[PDB]
Each structure stands twice: as structure tokens, then as C-alpha cells.
Amino acid sequence: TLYIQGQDEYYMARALKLAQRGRFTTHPNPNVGCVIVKDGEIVGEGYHQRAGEPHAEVHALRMAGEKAKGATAYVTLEPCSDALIAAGVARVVASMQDPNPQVAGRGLYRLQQAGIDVSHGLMMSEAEQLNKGFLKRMRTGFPYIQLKLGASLDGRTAMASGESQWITSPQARRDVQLLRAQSHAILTSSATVLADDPALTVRWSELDEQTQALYPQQNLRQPIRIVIDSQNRVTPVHRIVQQPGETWFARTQEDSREWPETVRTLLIPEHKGHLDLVVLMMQLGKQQINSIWVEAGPTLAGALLQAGLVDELIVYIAPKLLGSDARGLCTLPGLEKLADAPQFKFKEIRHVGPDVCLHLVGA
Amino acid sequence: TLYIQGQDEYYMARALKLAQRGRFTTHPNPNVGCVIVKDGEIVGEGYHQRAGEPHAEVHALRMAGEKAKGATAYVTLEPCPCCDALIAAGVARVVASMQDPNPQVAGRGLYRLQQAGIDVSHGLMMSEAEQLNKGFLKRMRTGFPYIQLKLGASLDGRTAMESQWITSPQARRDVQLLRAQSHAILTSSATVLADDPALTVRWSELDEQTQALYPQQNLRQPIRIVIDSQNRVTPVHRIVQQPGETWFARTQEDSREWPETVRTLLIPEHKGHLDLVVLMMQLGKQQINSIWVEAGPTLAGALLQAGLVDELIVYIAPKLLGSDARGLCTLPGPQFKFKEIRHVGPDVCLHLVGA
Numbered sequence: 001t002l003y004i005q006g007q008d009e010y011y012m013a014r015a016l017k018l019a020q021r022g023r024f025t026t027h028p029n030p031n032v033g034c035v036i037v038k039d040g041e042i043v044g045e046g047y048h049q050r051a052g053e054p055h056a057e058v059h060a061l062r063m064a065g066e067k068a069k070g071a072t073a074y075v076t077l078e079p080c081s082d083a084l085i086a087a088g089v090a091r092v093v094a095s096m097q098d099p100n101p102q103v104a105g106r107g108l109y110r111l112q113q114a115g116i117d118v119s120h121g122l123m124m125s126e127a128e129q130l131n132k133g134f135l136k137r138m139r140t141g142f143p144y145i146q147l148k149l150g151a152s153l154d155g156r157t158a159m160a161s162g163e164s165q166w167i168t169s170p171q172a173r174r175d176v177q178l179l180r181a182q183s184h185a186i187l188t189s190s191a192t193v194l195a196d197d198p199a200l201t202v203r204w205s206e207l208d209e210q211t212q213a214l215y216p217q218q219n220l221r222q223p224i225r226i227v228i229d230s231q232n233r234v235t236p237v238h239r240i241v242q243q244p245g246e247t248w249f250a251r252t253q254e255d256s257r258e259w260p261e262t263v264r265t266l267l268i269p270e271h272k273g274h275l276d277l278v279v280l281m282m283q284l285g286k287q288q289i290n291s292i293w294v295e296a297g298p299t300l301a302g303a304l305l306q307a308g309l310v311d312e313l314i315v316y317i318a319p320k321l322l323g324s325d326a327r328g329l330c331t332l333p334g335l336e337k338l339a340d341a342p343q344f345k346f347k348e349i350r351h352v353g354p355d356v357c358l359h360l361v362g363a
Numbered sequence: 364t365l366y367i368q369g370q371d372e373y374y375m376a377r378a379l380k381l382a383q384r385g386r387f388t389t390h391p392n393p394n395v396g397c398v399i400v401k402d403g404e405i406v407g408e409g410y411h412q413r414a415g416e417p418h419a420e421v422h423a424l425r426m427a428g429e430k431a432k433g434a435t436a437y438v439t440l441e442p443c444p445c446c447d448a449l450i451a452a453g454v455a456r457v458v459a460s461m462q463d464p465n466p467q468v469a470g471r472g473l474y475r476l477q478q479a480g481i482d483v484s485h486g487l488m489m490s491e492a493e494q495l496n497k498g499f500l501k502r503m504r505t506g507f508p509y510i511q512l513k514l515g516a517s518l519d520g521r522t523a524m525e526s527q528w529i530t531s532p533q534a535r536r537d538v539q540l541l542r543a544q545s546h547a548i549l550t551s552s553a554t555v556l557a558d559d560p561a562l563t564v565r566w567s568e569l570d571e572q573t574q575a576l577y578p579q580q581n582l583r584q585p586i587r588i589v590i591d592s593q594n595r596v597t598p599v600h601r602i603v604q605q606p607g608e609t610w611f612a613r614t615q616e617d618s619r620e621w622p623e624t625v626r627t628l629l630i631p632e633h634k635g636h637l638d639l640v641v642l643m644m645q646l647g648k649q650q651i652n653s654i655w656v657e658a659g660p661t662l663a664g665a666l667l668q669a670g671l672v673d674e675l676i677v678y679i680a681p682k683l684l685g686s687d688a689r690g691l692c693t694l695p696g697p698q699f700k701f702k703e704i705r706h707v708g709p710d711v712c713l714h715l716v717g718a
């Protein structure tokens with residue numbers, strides 16, 4: 001009646017902390033933790049690591065063996081739609097009950113047919129936070145979008161018009177690598193590719209102590225690189241396409257040149273002489289992208305904000321002031337209905353070396 | 364002797380806390396706190412309240428009376444008449460957090476007491492004490508006021524802070540708090556002509572410090588300083604009809620009748636503009652400890668380019684304001700480092716310092 005809940009919250013927390021270990025590698029699959037308990041002891045633990053790799057339940061089940069019979073399997077996300085039954089468990093505690101299918105949304109009850117005690121809703125908020133992007137793609141058709149911005153004190157960027165993105169500091173660079181690494185994809189404009197010739201990869205060495213936990217060097221997963229170039233200005237000789245992993249171009253007309261194996265291309269309709277960002281997002285949704293980290297110059301960020309597609313703002317502020325000639329999405333207007341678009345609230349603020357990071361979500 | 368270090372730390376902390384109670388009403392005098400201890404018991408406490416009123420040590424000594432005879436006084440600033448009071452009330456030991464900065468020739472205060480057979484030290488929490496009087500200490504050391512430049516911003520850098528600010532109540536309350544502790548508030552005539560502000564502290568807009576020092580009848584209106592080199596401000600603008608003084612930084616004498624509480628400061632031009640450096644120097648001679656700047660982009664920028672800004676206080680609103688209302692600075696061309704950052708209602712406030 002009472003101590004059961006006290007213990008329930010203990011083991012679910014444990015199952016949630018395991019699910020997290022998969023957040024770098026799991027895409028397009030969600031994160032899932034599973035903890036099997038018999039007589040106050042964990043007989044089996046597991047989390048989903050990679051799309052083709054075994055489910056969390058499978059991992060924990062293999063571990064528990066015949067010791068599973070007893071009772072209580074703590075899961076992060078409703079199973080099925082199986083082995084949990086064939087390994088005769090009693091009680092199962094689910095945190096969440098399966099997003100989109102909705103037609104198949106109580107495979108939770110399939111275990112009840114086997115006489116298995118079930119229940120859901122434990123720390124559902126935390127399990128929600130754990131799969132923000134995946135869960136968004138399922139409910140809506142849209143990937144979850146984090147917009148990174150490098151600004152000075154007076155708003156403003158890079159001192160020059162060039163759509164080149166300001167990195168503000170090495171610490172801010174190190175901080176972005178970690179956020180990059182849990183994104184399904186990274187998005188940028190062809191202008192940024194032309195102005196910076198960047199790799200837009202994750203570099204394992206730039207990660208910290210999450211180095212120790214999962215993500216050993218060999219497991220490193222490169223987020224999918226997405227480039228917007230309607231006018232096909234990016235060359236097959238640009239660094240970005242030479243990096244390991246796929247790189248997808250969002251272009252208007254198919255490119256005639258010879259591009260590396262890893263290079264793909266999505267054709268996107270226009271909207272007032274410009275590539276339609278809303279269509280593209282949705283298109284990326286169909287293509288199973290959970291979450292996008294955007295390395296935007298002035299134009300891209302503005303267009304995303306005005307299209308109401310951004311879920312989160314991450315603003316890195318350098319302790320500098322910039323002159324008139326400084327570009328800045330800031331002082332320099334361009335946009336009209338930002339005041340009348342999904343507004344954001346502050347969520348976290350932190351020092352990041354000489355910079356500060358302002359974390360904003362639409363909320 | 365480690366427990367004595369522990370006791371000293373406690374009593375100095377307390378003296379610092381006491382000193383802080385005068386931060387709203389002490390200008391041009393520093394904030395000073397004193398705690399007298401007589402074998403383990405606090406027998407006298409005191410802090411400075413106002414330039415007209417007595418020094419912290421005198422308050423504390425008055426409370427201790429005969430109890431001061433025994434031993435230790437904790438002062439947050441070396442004492443300087445007022446040094447006879449300490450010697451006359453035969454203390455053993457005074458512990459000062461820092462020595463006087465006015466200048467390095469004044470540092471004699473402690474040596475005066477040591478001749479009387481008092482065991483003296485200095486340096487204990489000389490850092491907190493330093494933070495206690497930034498403006499005053501800077502003036503004494505460099506005849507310049509400590510300048511704090513406030514800025515109000517949307518996420519897209521657009522000037523978004525005029526009392527109906529697109530920022531927030533909480534942020535408006537915060538500014539009042541910070542205004543309340545500046546010796547002076549400085550603005551441009553451009554802001555005066557545009558907004559017609561009072562530039563005062565409204566006591567009701569304060570919180571729990573309502574109860575501290577600072578009952579409503581002790582309200583000290585910070586000195587209003589306005590830059591109009593072209594004498595465009597009028598004697599009928601709200602700012603001059605407020606309690607307290609307003610000082611006009613002028614290039615040339617105005618000819619109109621102004622209330623008795625108004626002054627002008629004649630400031631030379633430097634290449635076509637009023638020389639801000641000389642103004643700050645002159646505000647220094649005028650004993651201005653500290654200046655809270657509430658302006659617009661032009662002035663915010665001239666101060667920044669002159670090298671006169673000691674700290675930035677940047678309020679950012681979680682609003683997105685593209686074309687609405689302009690940018691924060693002009694900068695036709697110091698640098699900064701972040702200190703405290705904090706939430707203020709739905710806004711964030713980022714503090715920065717020169718170095």
C-alpha cells in the first residue's frame with residue numbers, strides 16, 4: 001500500500017537513469033530502461049542501445065533468467081506491439097503507454113490477459129522528458145527542434161554580414177558537442193557551409209565523463225547532417241560531405257554533380273521564392289528524424305522562428321559588445337510577426353566558461 | 364589559535380552585515396559596521412546610517428559604554444575625530460577588514476591605535492568589505508565614480524526596457540532596488556525628452572528592505588544627473604519637480620529660472636561633444652560615489668567607448684522583438700566578464716564587470 005510506492009519510485013528512477021545511457025545512440029528508436037526486481041533485489045537491468053540492437057526488456061530478461069518468474073518488471077515505455085510473458089513475470093510497472101499508434105496503445109493490457117498485474121503513469125513526466133523528440137514526431141509529424149544562437153551582449157553576431165556562425169568560445173564549442181551528440185540530426189544553411197566549411201560532426205574527445213558511461217569511442221554515432229541549399233551552391237569538395245555518416249541536402253532541383261556515397265538529397269517545394277521550412281521539417285519527420293540541432297546563421301534562425309518550428313532556444317552569449325556593422329539577428333530587424341509567434345520562457349541559465357548559456361523553451 | 368580565526372570570522376561577518384544596512388543612505392560616506400566583543404559576548408554593535416549622523420564605531424561604543432573596557436572591536440574599515448573614542452574606551456584589540464584608501468598615505472589609522480597598546484590587524488574578509496563600497500573606494504583611489512550601466516533587452520537584442528516596460532514587474536522592482544543604492548542616477552536629455560521620467564526611487568516598489576533600514580521617511584532620493592549639452596530639457600519636465608537634486612551637465616549656462624534644488628555643471632567639449640571623462644572627473648570632485656545609468660543606445664554607447672563603465676546590468680526579456688524597437692548600443696568603432704547571472708521573474712539579469 002505504502003512502501004510499494006516508495007520502492008516503485010526507487011526502481012523506476014533506476015530504470016530511467018539506464019534509459020538515459022542510450023540517448024546518444026538510440027535514434028530513431030526511443031530510450032528505454034528496464035529493471036527486474038525479486039524480493040528487494042535487482043535480478044536484471046537493461047536499456048536500448050541501438051535501432052537494430054535488442055530492446056531493453058530483452059537485455060534485462062536475458063540477465064534475470066529464471067529469476068524473473070517471481071515478480072515486478074519496471075519499464076520506461078510500454079512493451080509489445082511477448083518475452084515478458086514467456087519469462088513468466090508477475091507485476092509490471094510502465095511509466096508511459098505508447099505514443100502515436102493509439103490503435104495499438106494498450107499492449108500494456110496484453111500482459112493482463114496472461115494474468116500479469118500491470119500499471120502505468122509512474123514518473124511519466126521524467127519519461128516524457130527522456131524522449132521529447134521521438135514523442136513529438138509520433139504525436140505531431142514534426143522532429144523536435146533546438147535552435148542554437150551565438151550572440152554578443154547587444155544581440156548581434158560575427159561582426160560581418162556573412163551567414164557564418166559565431167562560436168563565441170572553446171567552452172561553448174565543448175558544450176555544443178554534447179548537445180549535438182544526443183540529436184538525431186544537425187541542420188544548417190548552405191551559407192554556413194560556404195562561409196565556414198565546417199565538419200558539423202561530433203568529436204568524441206570534446207565530450208567529457210559521458211565518455212566513461214556509454215559512448216566509448218567506437219560506439220560514436222554521427223548525427224545526420226542536413227544542409228539547406230536551394231540554389232545548389234555547396235560543392236562535393238566541401239568538408240561536410242567528406243565526414244563519416246550521411247549528409248542530406250534540402251534542395252529545390254536535383255544536383256547534377258557526382259556526390260559521395262553518403263550524400264542524399266530531398267526535393268522541397270518553394271514558398272515565396274524560398275525553400276519551405278515547414279514542409280521540410282514534416283518531410284524529415286516522415287524520414288524518421290526525432291530531433292534536430294540547428295547551427296543557424298542570421299537568416300535561418302529567423303525563418304525558423306517565424307515559421308513556428310522551434311521547440312527550444314539555446315543562446316550562447318559572449319561577454320562582448322559589437323559595432324554597427326555587426327550583423328545580429330538582433331538590432332537588424334527583417335522579421336515582422338515574431339512578437340506574434342510561439343513565445344518562449346526561460347528554463348535554465350548557466351555559465352559556460354567565459355560565456356553564459358540561456359536555455360529557452362516555447363512553453 | 365584556530366578557534367580565534369573562527370570567532371573573528373563570525374564577528375567580522377556580522378560587522379559586514381551591519382554595514383550593509385546603511386547602503387541606501389550613506390552616500391557620500393562609506394558603509395561601515397562595528398561589533399565590539401567582551402570575552403565572547405557582543406556588547407556593542409553599530410553601523411553608519413548617514414553623512415550627518417555618527418560613525419559606526421561611535422554608535423557601537425555608545426552601546427558598549429563601560430563594557431568596551433576589556434577587548435576586541437571588529438571594524439569593516441580602518442577607523443580615523445573618532446580614533447580617540449576607541450582609545451578612550453580602552454579596548455584591547457581592533458580587527459579592521461581593510462585599511463583606508465584615501466590614499467595610501469592615510470593608512471596610518473591602525474598604527475595610531477597600536478601606539479596605544481592595542482593589538483591591531485587588517486585584511487580579514489577584505490574582499491567582502493571591498494564589495495561593500497565599490498563606488499566610494501574607486502573614487503578615493505581614482506577620483507572617478509563607479510559606473511553601473513543598465514540595459515534592457517529582448518532575446519533579439521531590441522531595446523525592450525517608459526515604465527510600462529515589456530520586461531516585468533519583478534525586473535522593475537529589481538531596478539528600484541539597485542537605483543535605491545546608487546549615489547546618483549544618470550540619464551541623457553534624449554531619454555528625458557522622450558519618456559519624461561521622474562527617475563526616483565518609489566519606496567512602495569521595494570520589498571523586505573522596506574523593513575530593514577529604510578522606513579519611508581528615511582528615503583534618500585538618488586541625485587539625478589542629466590546630460591544636455593544643448594539645454595533642451597525644460598524646468599517643467601517631471602525630473603526637476605521630484606524631491607532631491609537634479610544636476611544638469613551642460614556645455615553652456617542655461618538662462619531660465621530653475622528650482623533651488625537644480626544645479627548645472629559646466630563641462631568642456633571634446634571634439635564637438637560634451638567630454639564625458641571630464642564630467643565623471645567632476646562628479647568625482649563633487650563626491651559622487653556611484654552612478655546608475657538609465658539611458659538609450661546613444662549614451663550607453665558613448666560611455667562604453669569612453670572606457671567609463673565599471674559594470675553592466677543586463678535584463679533580458681523572453682520576448683522576441685524584431686522590428687519593434689531598436690538596438691541597445693551605437694558603437695561607431697573595455698571588454699567584460701560575467702559575474703552573477705540570475706532570474707528575475709520571467710526575465711534574466713546578467714551582471715558583468717570590466718575585469
